[PDB]
Symmetry: C3
């Protein structure tokens, strides 16, 4: 099937950057235009990708079956509901009713998804030590942070805090065994682009947190940013090793983290906290996601995108 599930990272990353620029509108009006263009690109890619995936469910169902049951690959499916909610969040600026349908479909879906599949891992005997990949953050952690921000947007803040709490504690509970496994075993080259997901948790956390708490940059938020930057420096240093066997579309896995860096940076800028670190983060993230776009345009014009 020509569409790898992982490619939902593309509208994921583009949609989150849209939302990041959106929060700048009231400081710099031209940011709205930029926010709108990214949101439209992201929504169109999401529509294309949802229709391709429906095509897969219908005619390549065994391949979805097998990725669903894999203790490793099941995770990427969580990107479907996540981008669904993020597109819904973009659309809210134009049609709050369609946005809310999309947000609930995505929230119910991810919750149902993790309850069915993540819990089942606890029966033992299928997940193995080498199953301890960064992609596990998706169903467990990123899905919940996205429901939390998206439900806040619709005015459900208390409900938002529940899903936030689920994401935050799930993250702290998984990372310990992940980092220990990387230390000991690490990852073979073909999985290494997924190290980009390791960037995500702190930054997606604080961005979701600031969405629910009215943009108030407090101690918790500063604390998350600190640890976010620590992981960024580590990943920067690791980058040559990560792309040891070459650059590839898998690198879109950094995009959710990078985009949350941009988003959180806008909140910090608004609240007048580390404004310089903010400008740096926002510009850095944008340039990098920009490089991902240029490399994806390159591959599209060398017939090397789809399978």
């Amino acid at each position: 099937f020509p569409l790898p599930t992982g490619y939902f990272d593309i509208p994921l990353g583009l949609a989150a950057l849209s939302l990041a620029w959106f929060h700048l509108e009231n400081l710099f009006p031209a940011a709205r235009m930029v926010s709108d263009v990214l949101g439209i690109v992201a929504s169109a890619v999401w529509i294309l990708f949802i229709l391709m995936y429906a095509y897969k469910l219908r005619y390549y169902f065994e391949e979805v079956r097998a990725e669903y049951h894999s203790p490793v690959r099941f995770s990427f499916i969580a990107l479907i509901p996540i981008t669904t909610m993020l597109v819904g969040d973009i659309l809210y600026r134009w049609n709050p009713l369609i946005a809310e349908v999309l947000i609930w479909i995505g929230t119910i879906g991810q919750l149902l998804f993790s309850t069915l599949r993540v819990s089942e891992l606890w029966q033992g005997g299928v997940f193995e030590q080498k199953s301890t990949h960064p992609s596990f953050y998706l169903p467990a952690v990123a899905a919940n942070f996205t429901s939390a921000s998206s439900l806040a947007l619709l005015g459900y803040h208390d409900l938002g805090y529940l899903f936030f709490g689920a994401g935050m504690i799930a993250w702290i509970i998984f990372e310990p065994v992940l980092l220990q496994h990387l230390r000991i075993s690490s990852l073979e080259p073909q999985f290494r682009a997924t190290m980009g997901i390791v960037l995500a948790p702190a930054f997606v956390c604080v961005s979701a947190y600031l969405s629910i708490n009215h943009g108030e940059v407090d101690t918790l938020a500063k604390i998350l940013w600190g640890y976010g930057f620590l992981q960024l420096f580590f990943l920067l240093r690791l980058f040559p090793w990560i792309v040891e066997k070459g650059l590839n579309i898998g690198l879109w896995a950094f995009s959710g983290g990078l985009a949350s860096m941009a988003n959180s940076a806008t909140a910090f800028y608004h609240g007048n906290v580390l404004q310089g670190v903010s400008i740096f983060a926002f510009v850095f993230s944008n340039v990098m996601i920009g490089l991902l776009v240029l490399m994806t345009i390159y591959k599209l014009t060398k017939g090397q995108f789809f399978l």
Copy 2:
């Protein structure tokens, strides 16, 4: 010996539900009656069980010796001081002086217990990977949350926060390796009823927290509830697997978690936060502990309770 240490889960669960109903008195006066009846049942079962256990110490001491030294079974002993404190908490409504004796005996006991036994595990060579069971939450985590709430009740809030902090950080520090071990190895049928303890931490946490912080439902509390509900959904889905080889009195291990669900729910209802989720949680927990009571009455009348 006819009394398994695990059976202290019974007055544990009944006592915590008593305390849960107690907090409803000022919204609905008939809740006091219900709180009192459960507290009396719980206290009577606790007296019976304490006298049976003293009997074991005296005439079956090798069996206590061996459970004490087991890296797995030592944990259930922590239920003795825990229920001791909870009974003390019930009794406070009638006799604050006896309640405080019981609360200090239970606090000193659990602290002394964990300091002697839990620390010793760090000498290595006795605890094994397959020793990573949910029952380890008892000495480490539940004991401390119970001291914290119980010491708050007597007016020692700052002292309460120390034990709370010990419980909360101990929990976050153990769960990561527990969940990883369940993923990989899981648990054989005879230990599976102890999955019910996994429900407990978030809910016992927030309940203890609300006891110390004057019932103020804040961000931390909402965060804990979110993760509590995530684990509930997982455990619900896992339930058929949990009771694969049949229903049994071991299922009383859910009761501390269920009861803390009820207790925290009353605090949330009072503070006007997610009142509907609150009614659901309170009713759910009560029905389930109610089912545990009916199944225990059933077994008592088939001579299948004691050994």
Copy 3:
């Protein structure tokens, strides 16, 4: 080479105790004298030790090379920048300009150090399960807490909170796998003195936190203290096992934790919170670091300090 890297624990511990006494000046003026004497001793030992280590870099460079690459021994190098910052903090009372040079050198150094070396562990294949030692807290956790407090002192509170957050979350993320490894494997006698580092995190955490947050003893701070005392009781009980094969200069590894116990205790005393527990902690820590000094004076006069 006559100086083991670990011996930087000596000025580390002495410098942190200096800072602890410093905070008592405004309650009890004679504490300044005591603070100054310790700070001078600590600074002189630090100068001696820095010059010995420069000597090692220059003429014994292969030995630094090999300790740098060890997945276990690399950690102790982090003590160089840590004590550098702490000496800088002492000196601030006399010369704020030299203090700030030292603080930035130490912050840039530790950050650069961890980014180069700690991240590299994630390439796998060098760090092993038996590499899971308490010394790993140094580069990861203690280095960051020291930058955070030291940058607060110079007036950079928001920057302080970033490094604090990095330390705090790094700690919670490592301890889980550490404690599990001690439970299963523990440590051979020659590494056991490093159990003293396990005392450090909660107490260094809360001390750094109180430095940044203006000494305000809040819920988070009480929570950290609770868990700090839990680990203290465990370590007390473990002590005979720790010194099974004899007392040795390695025991200076407790000194950062003990000194942070003293420091945090002063903040708690000021804010009128658990003042009695505070007096106990302050006196306890001082007596113990005092015993370490007497045993070090003893060994110095038996020619059994340097190699």
